[PDB]
């Protein structure tokens, strides 16, 4: 394995950092290869695939982009309110193609979406809404509950002919400030927090994920999570940078029959590589409980699974044991479970376990962990408690444990606030100048010897994650 974007430990972008340039490249050299597939379980139970090749994907992207360039201006924000299907990605990439700031959200009519859609739209004030014909009515209804002066143009992406792309203008190469999209994430503030993720942020973090998971050509990506999610888009954005196709289903499709995700994770005949996917802790439990094939099932081979990214709350030892007990007999490698630390402020990925290692879980003093120190004890101990690792910090980014008040790096084992830095870090919160400075632009005033900030410059900006944790024995631990 070798990362095509890394040269001498440095992330190099020869063909720019435009993910638009990457998609167009595949559309030119492998236009007839599969790019994106949506497993539709709305009608049938084993699902019918909706496919979209690289050239087809480009055709739809440029068509929507051309329409957006007629009704929006550079700097405008375009909210994506499609149902979870192919048209969602068409809309999202379409907004990027148009040279506008995408805002990945959700169809209001779709159930199981957590987020204050009203307050979010209040924050970014989009000039256009992207949806589908099937959902356009529900969208128009939702906006009737909003003031008249904030009911922006609604565009059904599937209603835009392919030949519209004829007038599409490719936006000039973006610098390091050009915002690709706004990623809104959970918070307790009244005004929702939308991380400004630049094209440089996107490309950098995708590369950092590729490096961490040893992603290659031949590796296909899979996801069931809603696109509006801290880890909802990363696997999809992986496909254009790596050149292999991405497969997805609705969240509800997974909840109904989690075996569908297990099946798609499994080896297909013709596979030259592994499967990469994402699943929070509860998803592992749900799959282990309801996603194991009945007796008499067709062969299930999970020996191909490369990485299932699991974030961001610490994975349970009980969950790890249960999932391996359930799918281990089907060939599932324990090392495929990749516990990780991630957040929207860093685009997503910050740390995960090494490629050849299983989830590291250690037994530490329960109350000493409460006193702010990580100390290993025996399993027999009455003060014993299991604590799972978040692995090691990815390439071209740093994480440090600091004393929050004095901005001073702490010795290993000691719990403090986690500060992070790198080119994947967002450039602020939309519409929150002061909150942006406070969170994204901190200076590290003191380092230990050795330091976890080794490689970072003095004027490197550090992100106050708000999370607390500690380094222990070469691994990062999130404790709060």
Numbering used by the authors: 3 to 482
What does the paper say about this structure?
FadD32 is one of the 34 FadD proteins of M. tuberculosis annotated as putative fatty acyl-CoA synthetases, and its role in mycolic acid biosynthesis is to activate C48–C64 meromycolic acid for condensation by PKS1313.
As our own initial studies indicated that MtFad32 tended to aggregate, we decided to crystallize FadD32 from M. smegmatis (MsFadD32), which has 74% sequence identity to MtFadD32. We determined the structures of apo N-MsFadD32 and ATP-bound MsFadD32 at 2.4 Å and 2.25 Å resolution by molecular replacement. Firstly, to accommodate the adenine moiety of ATP, the side-chain hydroxyl of Ser314, which forms a hydrogen bond with the main-chain carbonyl oxygen of Gly344 in the apo state, rotates 180°. Secondly, the side-chain carboxylate of Asp232, which forms a hydrogen bond with the side-chain hydroxyl of Thr187 in the apo state, rotates approximately 90° to make room for the α-phosphate of ATP. Thirdly, the P-loop moves a relatively large distance (5–7 Å) to stabilize the three phosphate groups of ATP.
